[PDB]
Nucleic acid binder design. Structure first.
Ligand SMILES: [Zn+2]
Lengths: 330, 420, 100, 96, 122, 110
RNA sequence: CUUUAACAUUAAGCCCUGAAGAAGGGCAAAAAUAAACCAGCGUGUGGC
């Protein structure tokens, strides 16, 4: 827009994401290309994002400039310009919650600095190798104490319904909002007024400056974990028109297809009362797939057929000598 | 040349019951369009394509005429003598063989001519279905229940459509229900819906009274007028020819057992079976069968039928929104006004006061002559100048130049109102 | 529908068709410049026909040509010269054009 | 073709059901086979009351008749015409 | 179609010595075991194996295909002149093998004697 | 004897309005539907018998045969064209190459 | 038993605006969503 002052930034709430989006992608297939109409509820669509041509239903009903605004029912497509195809977001509702990769691996670890917990412990929680304890109560165990399967089994012998121990991203999500914010600040300020050792004062001033900045913002510790993941307007990652047959795919489209396939398979496995080992493995696969989507560099894994180069994730479209600061905005 | 055309013919080679030589005639008519008027001016062509060998015979001819105009197509009487009198003025028969030329535009318009021939053949098939089936009671099982219409297979691989405005507002059927309807509309040239079926038009009620009561079809009882408002209220007029049969008492039937079954078809819709009369006022008196009518003043020049109702019988006569008496209007063909005691008294006093004001203002007359014109029964100025003089010369106390001056004043008043 | 190598191109003059022969290909040795037609290629353009019977007659009788979009290989801008050699390569199955 | 075919036929009004019986005889004779019946029933009265206000301190007899149609050798056109016909509202054409 | 119940997972009986480990891992298309930890895969629980052997016990039919049928159920008829029409059955004669089905035709119940193979149970 | 309409009692609520306004004024002019736009179609229905329509319903079997003929002929022609245009070359590979390139133009933007 | 029987039609609301029984709405309740017609990115080479 025009006549705007300072740019503002903050984290993004799930309800903010539902305020953004214009439909929920469900099918991992791009286009049918028998006829070159886009498939409904795919990564491309017309009811979700917008009209394929200008001022036309996908069904091909209303073709006149004096019918603007009223949608079709043959295709559900609002008759508008194709510029709308550049600007409407989309959302995907995940089966399991999912850890953001930047806030895990910026290395000052935001989760680890927030919870006062080392990074490798949080890593082997998120990749399904351990447990944390969430309000153990009348229990020998403490809160941030982590276990293995054997200590978990022995605790289930001991305090079988007392402690509440989970694993995966839901466990970290449980630990985040279970923590208050004012009490930690006042307790650690009193402890810094009761401390003379220097390195302890360094770490504690870091932690209370983190907490004071985190409270003086608007946001919350729930929002570092994803629940609803947004997708880019499909003109902004276009499908390459080849000459003869098939269309050449981008990198983002392959990554979204992999994520949506994994999400649908996990949702069906939750629908059929699967055993626990398989849903643990599938949640680890989905966490790794979103970590492959947001930044391919921390796990240099996603390579395509006939070209064993790393695919360009969303963070690779900003950094470097070709991202949108050095390349296209200067 | 002949191989491609023969491949088209063998490709379009339908059954022997389907016309295949009309395909030859249509494609040679397309060739005659692309060859006769080509491209602007001005020649003639004949072209005939055999079916057995598939070899075109394109005789590029000219029209035999001895006319002093149009020299571009003329053949005189010498070739008629060479013909030994088998041709006359207008025909073209000679034997100059010309090769068939092609073009993008000629092949395009030949495609257009043949596909319009095929659409006319589809039109011919729908009309051949429609001659036996001009309009009938259909009883079909639904194929698809869509959100706007349902379709019916009526045997031997046919289809009929009926939308939601042709049905009752509460019809929601299931697969396997023999529903009954009336074909009413057809558009064989249109590619879309071609057989319109209804259930909520009064021709369905005509067909119900024809199927139910036999003597209506046996030329005893004459149903002339009908009107409905579906699910709620309807009226229908019957008239006997044999005086031995009561028309209302038989069309209602014993205990109303017939039309109540018709009320099964329409869902409680109260159908007033009344007697047709030639006098429209007495017909409207007969038409309000669950009501009572006191008096009706009919003025068809003003398109009014003022109906007087008795006191207390207003709600049963009017009903909901004044519709059924309006349906009685649709039963009468004339505008029947809604019946109300005090409103019609106010309307009659309005007509009387308007007549008095017009007589005292626009005629330049005295009070007694206007009193005579009010008491005669003439409330408008239209029946004072166009009326014959046999009713005006009999007025006592007025001679001939005075009544001629009064007719002149009436014509001047009508010219003043007509130019106001 | 397929594409043609015919010399029939709408919306162009007669003079640009002069260097072409009747088969749709410029002669060996015609000195052309930038912009003229080397090889005349046309594409079908419906756009909306959707008739399950008309497409049967168009694919045989209607030339495989109903409405035509120009897709002829033209000379790029600036370059000039003299056409010294033409090669024609036909798939097994299509009958060869007379210039081939 | 389920050749053992029974039909009972209800009659409130004798004229309408005689008309329908003549239509059944016509649509059975114009398809190839021959029809039998009716062999009618005598007067079977009904016990049906009316909705009338009681007196502080119509009809009683409903003449209904039955008719019988037996078919032992049908055709496909006969049962098709028995499944493609129309009737008057309020009467029964129950093929037992 | 015939859907695989778990896409891309195999349930395998073992006794879990290290020879069994290196036997399974020396099979040309096998990715590693899925357990609670590496070097010791967790065995699956007992109520889950009972629930996964129970979810393959629904393919047992005959009874009751057509020969055991209740009265008072609106079903369909596919044979005779009443082919593909709905109707309410009145009684079920198991001895005579004749269903007395009143087909709802013209908004009216028409009773007729039919067979179990001549009707469609709906 | 019901008279349980909302518009009726609302008109009875505003009876003073129609009592004051209709002093030397008409009451209502409301036109209905006319039988001119209604085809009666009642010339003859005596040969239009129900049992004759039972023996003779409507028919579009020839339409289905014609449509099946069109579909079968078009399927044969398109199967032959997609058979000899997307064939597989044998043991040696694609014996030519596409080589198609598109240059640029100077396109104004008025 | 002395020369053909039959008057039927009981169901869908309440409120506001409006010259009305011309029309415009909300709320107690719900099955069900042809055509005449303007006009790229990833490798290599080389240069500075
Ligand atoms: Zn649409």
């Amino acid at each position: 827009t025009e006549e705007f002052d300072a740019i503002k930034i903050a984290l993004a709430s799930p309800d903010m994401i539902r305020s953004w989006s214009f439909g929920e992608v469900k099918k991992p297939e791009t286009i049918n290309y028998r006829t070159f109409k886009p498939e409904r509820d795919g990564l491309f669509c017309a009811r979700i994002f917008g009209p394929v041509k200008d001022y036309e239903c996908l069904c091909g009903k209303y073709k006149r400039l004096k019918h603007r605004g009223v949608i079709c029912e043959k295709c559900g497509v609002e008759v508008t310009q194709t510029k709308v195809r550049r600007e409407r977001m989309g959302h995907i509702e995940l089966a399991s919650p999912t850890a953001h990769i930047w806030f895990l691996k910026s290395l000052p670890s935001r989760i680890g600095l927030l919870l006062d917990m080392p990074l490798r412990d949080i890593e082997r929680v998120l990749y399904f190798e351990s447990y944390v304890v969430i309000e153990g109560g009348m229990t020998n165990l403490e809160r941030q104490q982590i276990l293995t399967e054997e200590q978990y089994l022995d605790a289930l012998e001991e305090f079988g319904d007392e402690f509440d121990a989970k694993m995966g991203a839901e466990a970290i999500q449980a630990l985040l909002k279970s923590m208050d914010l004012e009490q930690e600040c006042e307790q650690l300020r009193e402890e810094l007024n009761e401390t003379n050792s220097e390195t302890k004062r360094k770490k504690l001033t870091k932690r209370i400056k983190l907490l004071e900045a985190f409270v003086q913002s608007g946001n919350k510790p729930e929002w570092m974990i994803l629940t609803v993941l947004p997708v880019l307007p499909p003109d902004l990652r276009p499908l390459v028109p080849l000459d003869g047959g098939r269309f050449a795919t981008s990198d983002l489209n392959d990554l979204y297809r992999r994520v949506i396939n994994r999400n649908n398979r996990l949702k069906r496995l939750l629908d059929l009362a699967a055993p626990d080992i398989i849903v643990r493995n599938e949640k680890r696969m989905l966490q790794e797939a979103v970590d492959a989507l947001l930044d391919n560099g921390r796990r240099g894994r996603a390579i395509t057929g006939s070209n064993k180069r790393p695919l360009k994730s969303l963070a690779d479209m900003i950094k470097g000598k070709q991202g949108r600061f050095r390349q296209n905005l200067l | 040349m002949n191989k491609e055309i023969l491949a088209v013919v063998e490709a379009v080679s339908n059954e022997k019951a389907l016309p295949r030589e009309k395909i030859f005639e249509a494609l040679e008519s397309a060739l005659a369009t692309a060859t006769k008027k080509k491209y602007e001016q001005e020649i003639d062509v004949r072209v005939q394509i055999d079916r057995k060998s598939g070899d075109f015979d394109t005789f590029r001819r000219w029209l035999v005429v001895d006319e002093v105009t149009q020299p571009t197509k003329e053949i005189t009487l010498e070739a008629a003598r060479y013909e030994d009198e088998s041709l006359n003025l207008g025909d073209y028969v000679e034997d100059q063989i010309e090769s068939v030329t092609f073009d993008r535009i000629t092949t395009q318009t030949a495609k257009q001519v043949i596909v319009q021939k095929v659409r006319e053949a589809e039109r011919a098939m729908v009309v051949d279905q429609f001659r036996e089936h001009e309009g009938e009671i259909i009883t079909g099982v639904v194929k698809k229940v869509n959100r706007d219409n349902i379709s019916l297979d009526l045997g031997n691989n046919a289809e009929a459509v009926i939308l939601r405005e042709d049905m009752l507002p509460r019809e929601n059927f299931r697969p396997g229900d023999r529903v009954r309807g009336v074909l009413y509309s057809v558009r064989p040239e249109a590619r879309g819906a071609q057989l319109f079926v209804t259930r909520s038009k009064p021709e369905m009620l005509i067909e119900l009274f024809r199927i139910e009561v036999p003597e209506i079809g046996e030329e005893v009882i004459e149903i002339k007028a009908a009107a409905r408002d579906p699910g709620s209220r309807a009226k229908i007029a019957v008239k006997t020819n044999d005086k031995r049969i009561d028309p209302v008492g038989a069309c209602v039937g014993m205990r109303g057992a017939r039309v109540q079954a018709v009320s099964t078809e329409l869902g409680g819709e109260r159908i007033d079976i009344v007697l047709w009369d030639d006098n429209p006022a007495q017909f409207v008196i007969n038409a309000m069968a669950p009501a009572d009518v006191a008096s009706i003043v009919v003025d068809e020049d003003k398109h009014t039928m003022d109906i007087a109702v008795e006191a207390g019988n207003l709600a049963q006569a009017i009903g909901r929104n004044g519709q059924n008496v309006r349906l009685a209007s649709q039963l009468s063909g004339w505008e029947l006004n809604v019946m109300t005691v005090d409103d019609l008294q106010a309307k009659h006093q309005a007509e009387a006061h308007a007549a008095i004001d017009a007589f005292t203002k626009y005629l330049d007359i005295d009070e007694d002559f206007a009193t005579v014109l009010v008491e005669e029964g003439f409330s408008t100025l239209e029946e004072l100048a166009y009326v014959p003089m046999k009713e005006l010369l009999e007025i006592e106390g007025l001679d001939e130049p005075t009544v001629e001056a009064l007719r002149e004043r009436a014509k001047n008043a009508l010219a003043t109102i007509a130019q106001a | 529908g397929p594409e043609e190598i015919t010399a029939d191109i709408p919306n162009v003059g007669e003079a640009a068709l002069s260097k072409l022969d009747e088969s749709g290909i410029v002669y060996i040795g015609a000195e052309v410049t930038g912009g003229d037609i080397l090889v005349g290629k046309v594409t079908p353009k419906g756009e909306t026909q959707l008739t399950p019977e008309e497409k049967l007659l168009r694919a045989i009788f209607g030339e495989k040509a109903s409405d035509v979009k120009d897709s002829s290989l033209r000379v790029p801008n600036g370059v000039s010269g003299t056409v010294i050699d033409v090669q024609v390569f036909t798939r097994d199955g299509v009958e060869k054009d007379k210039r081939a | 073709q389920n050749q053992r075919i029974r039909i009972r036929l209800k009659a409130f009004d004798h004229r309408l059901i005689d008309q329908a019986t003549a239509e059944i005889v016509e649509t059975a004779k114009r398809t190839g086979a021959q029809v039998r019946g009716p062999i009618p029933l005598p007067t079977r009265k009904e016990r049906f009351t009316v909705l009338i206000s009681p007196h502080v301190n119509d009809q009683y007899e409903i003449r209904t008749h039955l008719r019988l149609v037996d078919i032992v050798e049908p055709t496909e056109k006969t049962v098709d015409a028995l499944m493609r016909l129309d009737l008057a509202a309020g009467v029964d054409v129950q093929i037992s | 179609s015939e859907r695989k119940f778990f896409p891309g997972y195999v349930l395998v009986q073992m006794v879990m010595n290290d020879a069994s480990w290196h036997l399974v891992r020396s099979v040309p298309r096998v990715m590693g075991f899925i357990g609670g930890t590496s070097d010791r895969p967790a065995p699956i629980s007992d109520k889950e194996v009972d629930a996964i052997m129970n979810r393959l016990q629904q393919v047992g039919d005959k009874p009751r295909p057509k020969t055991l049928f209740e009265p008072g159920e609106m079903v369909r008829v596919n044979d005779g002149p009443f082919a593909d029409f709905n109707g309410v059955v009145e009684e079920v004669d198991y001895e005579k093998s004749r269903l007395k089905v009143s087909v709802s035709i013209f908004g009216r119940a028409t009773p007729v004697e039919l067979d179990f193979s001549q009707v469609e149970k709906a | 004897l019901g008279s349980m309409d909302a518009q009726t009692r609302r008109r009875e609520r505003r009876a003073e309005k129609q009592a004051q306004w209709k002093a030397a004024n008409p009451l209502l002019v409301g036109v209905s539907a006319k039988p001119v736009n209604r085809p009666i179609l009642s010339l003859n229905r005596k040969p239009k018998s129900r049992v004759e329509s039972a023996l003779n319903p409507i028919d579009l079997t020839v339409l289905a045969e014609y449509h099946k003929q069109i579909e079968s002929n078009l399927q044969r022609i398109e199967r032959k064209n997609q058979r000899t245009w997307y064939s597989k070359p044998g043991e040696r590979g694609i014996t030519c190459s596409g080589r198609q390139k598109i240059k640029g133009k100077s396109i104004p933007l008025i």
